[PDB]
Every structure is written in C-alpha cells, then in structure tokens.
Symmetry: C4
Subunit: 176 residues, 4 copies
C-alpha cells in the first residue's frame, strides 16, 4: 500500500496532509478526555478521570500555536478545574446542540473547517465532526461514529487517545 | 441472509424480530450499568460508576416509547440519583428475589413477557430472564448465565453493554 | 486428560480436591479488591469489591463451606464488607499469617486437607503451602503463580474469588442452587 | 541467544549486571506508581491509585540499602502521604524540569549515575533517564520513551511495574531465585 508509520500504527499519507494543516482541535470530554465513566456517591459526590499523558500533548499543541476548545453536554466544576489547569480557555458546557457552540468558536477564532479537527466518542459529536477536516473517533467510541471517522485512535478514550492525536499532528508537522 | 449485520456482529433475523417488539427493558444495576465494582471508603463512602454512552442509549429507547425498569439487590442513593437523572421511575432496590419485582412491573405496565427484555450479569437474574423474550447477558457476565442467554453483548458491563442492547432494539425498529 | 470448568480446563485431581473443601481462606488486597488503594488529598481511602464475588461467597456458605479472611493489613472498610457478606472469621493486621491459620483450623476443627487459600503475593505462601487448594489470582505475583495448584483465569477484584467458589460448587454439582 | 530468564521474560546479561549494582532508584509517580489517571471531584477532591504489591518491592530494595527518590511534575498531599508511609524522604513534587531535582539528589546522596536507575512513563522523564544506567519505561508508557529505554516493563504502570523493577534488582543481587 501507501501507508506511513506513526508511533501507534499505520495511516494513509492523505491523513497526515490533513493533520499537518490543523490550527484548531475541538474535543468532547466524556469518553475522550475521560473513559466515559461517571463516578457517583451516596452523598452526591461525582468524580471523573483524566490521563496525565494527555496534558503533555495538549500543551505541546498549544505551544505550536494550535487552539484547543472543548464542547460538552454535561456541566461540572470538574471540567472547569481540569481545563483551566491545562490552560484551555474555550470551554463550552451544558451543550445539547454542539453545532451552535462550534459556530461560536468559529466566529471567535475565524479558523476555517479545513483547518479544524474534532475528537469525539458518540453520535452527538457527529454533526460537528462532519463539518471539519480531521474527524477522530477514539478506539472504544461508538461503532457508528468509528465508521464515519477518518482517524480511529489506537488508544482508548481517557487513556491517552487525546495524546495520540496530538502526536499525530506534531508528527505531520515534522516536530516529532 | 442467514444473519443480519449489527454494529457489533451478526444476529439471526428471529432475534431482531424479538427486539423489534420490545416494549419494556428491565436491567440489573451492578455488573450491567456498572462493571460490578463497589468502591468503599474509610468514612463509609460508596461510589459506583455509570457510562455516558449507556445514558445516551437509555434516553433514545425512552424517546421511542419503550419503558425502562431497574431491579437490584443492593440499595443506594446513588441508584436513586442516577435513575431519576435519566428519567427512569420504575426502580426496585433491595430485592433478593427479583421475580416478585418483575411481577409488580408486569402488573404496573400491563406489558407481556413476550414484549420484555432483561439485561443481567449473574445467576440471580436468570429467574426473570427465563420468563421473557429477550434474555441478555453482558459480555463479561457469569459464564453460566452467558450460556443460557439468547443475546450476549460484545461490550463489557459498565462500558456500553446497555447501549449495545439499546442499539439492537433501535436497529430492529428501523430507527438506527 | 483435563476436565472443563466454566472458565477453562483443570486436572481431575484438582476437581477432586475442590469437591471436599470445607474451609476457604482468602487474603483481601489483590484477591477481593482490584489490588489498588485509592488515596485522596484529605486522607480519603477507597477499596473495591466485586458483586459477582459477593454472590459466590454467599453461595459457598449456603452449601455449608466455611469462609475466613487472613490479611496482613488492617482495614475497617474490609471489616464492614466481610461482616455484610456474613463472614465472621476475620483476622487482620496479621504478621504471623500461619498462627492465624492454626487458630482457624483449631476453632473449626477442619484439617488442612479440606482447606483452600486464595492469595496474590509471596506473604501468602506460608499459609498456602499448608493447604490442599492453593490458588493464585490470574494477575497475582508471578512467583506465587508458579507455586499455586490453581491459577484463576479472572483477575483479582473482578471475579477471581467467584471463580474459585464456582470450582468448588461445580465439583459438588451445586453451581446454581 | 544470550538471554537470561526473569519472572517476567528474558533480558540480556548486560542488564542484570547494571541492575545488580544499583544503589539509587528514582521514580516518576503518575503512570509509574499510579495508572496515570487523576480522579477529580466537584468539590475539588482528588484521588490517585497505588498498587498493593509495589510496597513490598520498594521496602525490599530499601532493606538492601538502596536509596529511593521520587520526582513528579504534579503536587499532592496524596504523594506525600504515600511516600512517607514507605519511609522515603527524597520527594520532589511540582517539578517542571526534573533535571534540577536529579542534580539535588546527586548532591545529597553522592551516588553516581552508573549506580542509578530511573522508572518513567513520558518524555519529561527522558532528560534524567538519559543520564543514568538503568533506564526503565513502563509497559504502557509513551511509545517514544519505550524506544529509548534499556528495560521496558511487562507489567503496566500502576499495576506492578515498580515491583517488577524491584524484582529484577533482587534477582540480580542473587536475593531472588528465578528458575
Ligand atoms: Mg462523549
Ligand atoms: Mg448484577
Ligand atoms: Mg493481597
Ligand atoms: Mg508520569
């Protein structure tokens, strides 16, 4: 074939061409930054997990001048805390309609969809992904989303899937 | 046309026909909505996990007019909170004998066992499953239960097993 | 050559050992729990237990088989959970694991030949070597795994205890009573 | 073939020679002692996991006279609590650049890089690892670090990767028989 090695497997050269040119990466939270689990307690405690290797990836992308934004349907202090800690400021929570949040991001940043990527794990993510150039489903994402993606990560959501996509972009940019 | 492709594998047309008819889906909690773990704390705290992709599936079935009920042997505020959040009201906790809860559900809804499904992970679930049309064991459920089931999920309990069953019914209904 | 179980294949002589077990002794961390200690910034600590193990232990006791715990650590979380399961013979903070075993053997009048033990690390070996059914969980320490006469297929904290309950219950034709 | 069996696989005798003479083992925390996850709550609670069998290994090394040091980029009371429970004193947290902490450890203990090991899981660990003799990446560490390591653990970070390295050292010291 015509495939090129990554740190994680093989991709079409056409995908690296797309990845090279990304200036905006938008991520869902649950199932992408986390593994999709919501930890619930009898006193109404709620936890969520994030992976340490993802932080390093996001920071590397932003150091390269790539904007990062988050769009999620849930709303938590957890997400505010984590995203602020990673230095991500474009945070959209409580979104039933992810398309409108995406439009708001577009109007703020003025970045074209050909230069935008999105990492999702479920069907609610599809209306935005469909519009952009890099369409990522995490390894364990909904199989119907995985069918529609142009990159399916090797690493599971919440375990380094975000880092994998950061590494893909950096490799494409010849910075890794 | 021996089998019909789903998002997860291949099913017999007879099984999709059973799925198409389902008006009531009954689920166990631990090992089905969760991975079977109970997290216990040094001040008596308790956590349990639920998965975001399951939440989406359960809402989709309810939007389609299908009733959802829960039967669990344990009792927690966690389960009350999670089920109310999803809009599930038929919640049976602290049930050692699941058959009595099943009969109560049947009488409350006037829905026949031929239009009912049950998702279980252990032997206590079998007395209810044996009565109903769609008898699901989660992928990692007890292996004797898996042998008796007429559908074994591919996704593990607590990670989208419930969503997989939701998808099967929605596919069967031509709504996926 | 081997006999099938719900989980894989064993020697008939192992099933024959399992059939006559009257006492099953378990360590806790890495056996009932997933081997992790969840620690928080305000001194929170969590430990996990698995619902299919709970069911197995109750089924084993319903069948007339005694359950005891011997752990090197002391945990009130563990006291709470074992008491909830109906287990009464709980020995914690046990440096001399073998002395605890001796006391259990005496208190119940059950011989080592009718006893099994489920462990995950080397500190478990001094009690294990004394008993007939010597179990290491699937993801136990490899030195203990190579000494065990049954290595579970299911990982620690995820049904390994249930798997051993099932081995005994299958040997007795009592898997689903 | 020149390899020697361990409890986990095969290694070159050269690696056992290095492991035999380690006097200092430096570890990252997240992804090495833990599974790399940070549990965060709505009241700002934080949890981290540690594996029950790693303590026996760390203690066995300390009882052999081997010094243990910890260098992490994150900061938590969790890590203070866990490491103090092991009798470890050289705990460096909130380290953006791990090389400085390493130099400080060298100053304090006067142990040379040739007698030093490091267990990491990501690229930030490499500038210290590159300087020392035993260079461990955990099984599921970042693939670029795994390429650079001289030992890649079989067991995943947070599930006994630390214990595995302890066992390698004990085996090398002839304190742990492997048939
Ligand atoms: Mg999601
Ligand atoms: Mg269950
Ligand atoms: Mg243990
Ligand atoms: Mg790390």
């Amino acid at each position: 074939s015509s495939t090129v090695s990554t740190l994680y497997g093989e991709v079409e050269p056409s995908l690296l061409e797309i990845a090279k040119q990304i200036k905006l990466l938008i991520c869902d939270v649950d199932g992408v930054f986390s593994d999709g689990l919501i930890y619930m307690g009898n006193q109404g405690e709620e936890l969520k997990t994030f992976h340490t290797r993802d932080g390093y990836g996001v920071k590397a992308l932003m150091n390269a001048g790539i904007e990062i934004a988050i769009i999620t349907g849930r709303r938590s202090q957890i997400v505010e805390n984590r995203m602020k800690a990673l230095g991500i400021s474009l945070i959209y929570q409580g979104q039933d309609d992810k398309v409108q949040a995406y439009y708001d991001i577009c109007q703020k940043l003025a970045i074209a969809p050909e230069q935008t990527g999105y990492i999702g794990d479920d069907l609610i993510d599809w209306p935005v992904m469909e519009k952009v150039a890099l369409r990522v489903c995490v390894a364990d994402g909904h199989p119907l989303l995985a069918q529609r993606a142009n990159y399916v990560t090797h690493i599971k959501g919440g375990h380094g899937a975000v880092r994998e996509v950061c590494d893909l972009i950096l490799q494409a940019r010849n910075e890794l």
